[PDB]
């Protein structure tokens, strides 16, 4: 890609890295919520780390939260909000490289 696309390529890697960072942050909270709702007996400090950290990734892609029927709708709304934020961040990562630059002197950069 070395040529007139290198500025575009360099900004986008950073933006996508930030998006992945936000996604990880969100996954931690999702896992904590799921672990808290489902399991109660388990108080071992060792198992909690396993659960909260790498249960959700297994749930997405792995071999391994609706127990309650009454709070389904608020959960759906929460899902919608998270979708909104993360999709916005991804699209900003996509389209960030255009705003700062100027078309007239793009070649020198």
């Amino acid at each position: 890609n070395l040529g007139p696309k290198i500025i575009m390529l360099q900004r986008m890697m950073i933006d996508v890295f930030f998006f992945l960072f936000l996604f990880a942050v969100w996954m931690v909270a999702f896992g904590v919520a799921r672990q808290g709702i489902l399991r109660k007996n388990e108080h071992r400090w060792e198992w909690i780390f396993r659960s909260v950290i790498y249960e959700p990734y297994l749930a997405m892609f792995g071999q391994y939260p609706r127990f309650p029927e009454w709070i389904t709708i608020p959960l759906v709304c929460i899902y919608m909000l998270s979708t909104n934020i993360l999709l916005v961040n991804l699209l900003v990562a996509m389209f960030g490289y255009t705003v700062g630059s100027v078309q007239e002197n793009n070649d020198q950069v």
Binding site: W26, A29, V32, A33, Q35, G36, H43, L75, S82
Partner: protein, 328 residues
């Protein structure tokens, strides 16, 4: 001047503008016009300038604008008033001319303020916040924000004034990490690791903690600590009778409630315009419901309260993510 030589058409149009596009300045102007139409006013030259402007007399308004005492403020207010006048669709031809005149005056005001700032920086900022009763107790910044003229705010000088207000007594040019390291460690500020902008010593410690930048960063750090506490308590500190730890958590949440009430009281109209503020408030109310369940001390309600707490935790994390996104 106001009873006889004031065009009836412009009066009828002004009426609509007062009725349906009501603004803080546009009610004071209407009151003055009505009082004249019926000692009465100070700042006579402002009254004559408004009379000239409302009839869209470009040259005769520019002439009288020079004799006025507060030039930049008068021009900004005239632009705002013309903006309000232009939003009336009863008459289109007049509205177009009014908008053109508004743009002319806005450009003139920004150019004049640049000229003023070039000579002396100290006096320009004192002038900027200056307020006169000639208008509705409004200063240049307050008038610019309501007028929604992007150029005046976008110019360098006001931006620098705002930036050094944001940093406060903290000296600029100090790299951010320097500030954060001083934030974690109390002693450093005293030694001279962080500079300052200008019995004597104590003011450094106080002013380091009243600057908005420091407070904002500290609040974010403490919010992360709060989320960790929340997670720990929820996962392995939930018992039949709430423990002291949960009580500390509840106290923190109540602090947050008061902070939200301040936003309701200070600026009510625009606070509910956006979804994210609504979500924060609904999250705190959700928490309240969760306590209501927890206190019943029945297992069936206990489990439901626990679930409520988990969902509220997710919502709080979403709030934090929103903060990070916009901050970056």
């Amino acid at each position: 001047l106001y009873t006889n030589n004031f065009s009836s058409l412009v009066f009828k149009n002004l009426q609509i503008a007062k009725n349906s596009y009501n603004d803080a300045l546009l009610t004071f102007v209407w009151k003055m016009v009505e009082d004249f139409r019926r000692p009465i006013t100070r700042h006579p030259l402002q009254a004559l300038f408004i009379w000239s402007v409302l009839q869209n007399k470009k040259e005769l308004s520019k002439v009288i604008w020079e004799q006025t005492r507060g030039c930049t403020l008068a021009a900004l207010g005239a632009s705002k008033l013309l903006k309000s006048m232009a939003k009336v669709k009863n008459d289109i031809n007049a509205a177009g001319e009014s908008e053109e005149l508004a743009n002319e005056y806005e450009t003139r005001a920004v150019e004049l303020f640049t000229e003023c700032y070039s000579n002396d920086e100290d006096l320009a900022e004192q002038l900027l916040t200056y307020s006169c009763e000639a208008w509705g107790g409004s200063n240049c910044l307050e008038l610019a924000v309501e007028a929604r003229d992007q150029q005046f705010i976008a110019q360098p000088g006001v931006q620098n004034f705002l930036s050094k207000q944001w940093y406060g007594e903290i000296s600029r040019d100090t790299k951010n990490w320097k500030i954060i390291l001083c934030l974690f460690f109390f002693p450093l500020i005293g030694c001279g690791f962080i500079s300052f902008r200008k019995k004597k010593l104590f003011l450094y410690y106080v002013s380091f903690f009243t600057s908005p930048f420091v407070v904002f960063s500290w609040n974010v750090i403490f919010y992360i600590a709060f989320l960790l506490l929340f997670a720990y308590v929820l996962l392995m500190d939930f018992q039949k009778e709430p423990t002291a730890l949960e009580i500390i958590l509840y106290v923190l949440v109540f602090i947050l409630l008061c902070d939200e009430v301040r936003q309701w009281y200070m600026n009510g109209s625009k606070y509910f315009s956006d979804l994210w503020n609504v979500m924060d408030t609904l999250a705190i109310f959700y928490f309240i419901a969760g306590i209501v369940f927890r206190l019943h001390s029945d297992e069936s309600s206990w489990y439901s309260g626990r679930v409520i707490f988990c969902l509220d935790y997710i919502v709080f994390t979403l709030r934090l993510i929103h903060i990070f996104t916009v901050s970056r």
